[PDB]
From Swiss-Prot, chains A, B:
The gene is ygiD. This is 4,5-DOPA dioxygenase extradiol. Its main location: cytoplasm. CDD domains: 45_DOPA_Dioxygenase. It catalyses: L-dopa + O2 = 4-(L-alanin-3-yl)-2-hydroxy-cis,cis-muconate 6-semialdehyde + H(+).
Length: 244, 244
């Protein structure tokens, strides 16, 4: 049974870097090797849900082989959710590419990209991870990447380095509610904009929503882990989450 | 009379970095301060020409004030070229943001973004810089950013560090033809795919085309300078060009 992973993304490198990259490389050594991976990124935020099997914007290159079989299986599992199927791969954002180059350096794990539907509310994205859960017993690792705090208008690129108190506030409300159980509509992490708090940490939903894909996939029983965490440049949250 | 600048973009930082960043900061200290700037990036590659006056994807933030006056003046100058006018700013690619944060750290120069028309041939993009030339006598600096060699399938992110010979070959054909004069249709840098050479260095045109915007703006008389140059990771060319 494969784990699902939400990674806070960014180290702005690298090669021989930091705590985060060593946590990614990390889980790539330590976690059960997947038959294939469904990648969810903050940066594939589209009207409607798209899927690529990667049979062919960003100053990056991650030549993982595609899995047309997993793509079709994704489309079927999601039906009647209408899915658009791209032939070509989508470019990987620097952050996602940064997680993947550290995690599985050799780009030898077959892969599908899944996009996040803009037009849908948080509860729906949580329901998505509920549907993706079945794939975890079929040798498939879910890797979602984004940032539970993500306001680049508040980011302090040089000085000083302490976490803004509102950043730590929202982040702790995230961590304290990972294991919440009950109706989806009443989930604190689904109703995240109910926090002070919420809109300032996430003025648009895309960097936060990927966590819900991972949380949607939790059975209520298996452990939930935090392989690495951190708030960089005052408001970039680096909170990573392991399900199972 | 304002200079036009093509910058090869990437240092993957920074703050206290390298030769390239110090060349950018650099020209920002040394060049005549502009009333406003038209930014052209490799990464705004669209069907049709777009313009933003910046009255409102990338893990970046460059809060330069817009210039609606320059935007309208751009639309008028280009007519009958059909232009789409966005209210909102487009996100800056890391490379462009990297050039601008070093060049004009304070983000206090008014600014317009101009996009590159996908559907048009190299000669047309050269003609674009011919039209943009007039704005140089109106206090306006053209800043184009991309990379005259740009194949991320050949990039050696770690080892070793020597420039591929084909990379140096195409690059030198670029440099040897900056000052070429004659009919546009017969310009070596317009007919760049005529080199061995060309398609391998530039499998799609977007990172190269921005130079033509700058070269289009040369009168035949003023100096053409190379403020910095370099080939990193075997095939990322860092060749920068100053017109006037
Ligand atoms: Zn680029
Ligand atoms: Zn980037
Ligand atoms: Zn954000
Ligand atoms: Zn991001
Ligand atoms: Zn390229």
């Amino acid at each position: 049974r494969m784990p699902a992973l939400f990674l806070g993304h960014g180290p702005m490198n690298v090669l021989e870097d930091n705590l985060y990259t060593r946590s990614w490389q990390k889980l790539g050594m330590t976690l059960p090797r997947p038959q294939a991976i469904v990648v969810v990124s903050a940066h594939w935020f589209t009207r409607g849900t798209g899927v690529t099997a990667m049979e062919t914007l960003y100053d990056t290159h991650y030549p993982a082989p595609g899995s047309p079989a997993l793509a079709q299986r994704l489309v079927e599992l999601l039906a009647p959710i209408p899915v658009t199927l791209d032939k070509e791969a989508w470019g990987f954002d620097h952050g996602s590419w940064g997680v993947l180059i550290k995690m599985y350096p050799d780009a030898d794990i077959p892969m599908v990209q899944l996009s996040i539907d803009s037009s849908k509310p948080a509860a729906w994205h949580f329901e998505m991870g509920r549907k993706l859960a079945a794939l975890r017993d079929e040798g498939i690792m879910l890797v979602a990447s984004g940032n539970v705090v993500h306001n680049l208008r508040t980011v302090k690129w040089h000085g000083d380095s302490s976490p803004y108190p509102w950043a730590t506030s929202f982040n702790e409300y995230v961590k304290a509610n990972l294991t919440w159980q009950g109706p989806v509509e009443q989930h604190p992490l689904v109703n995240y904009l109910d926090h002070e708090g919420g809109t300032l940490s996430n003025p648009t939903p895309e960097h936060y929503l990927p966590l819900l894909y991972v949380l949607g996939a939790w059975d209520g029983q298996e452990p939930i882990t935090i392989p690495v965490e951190g708030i960089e440049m005052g408001s970039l949250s680096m909170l990573s989450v392991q399900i199972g």
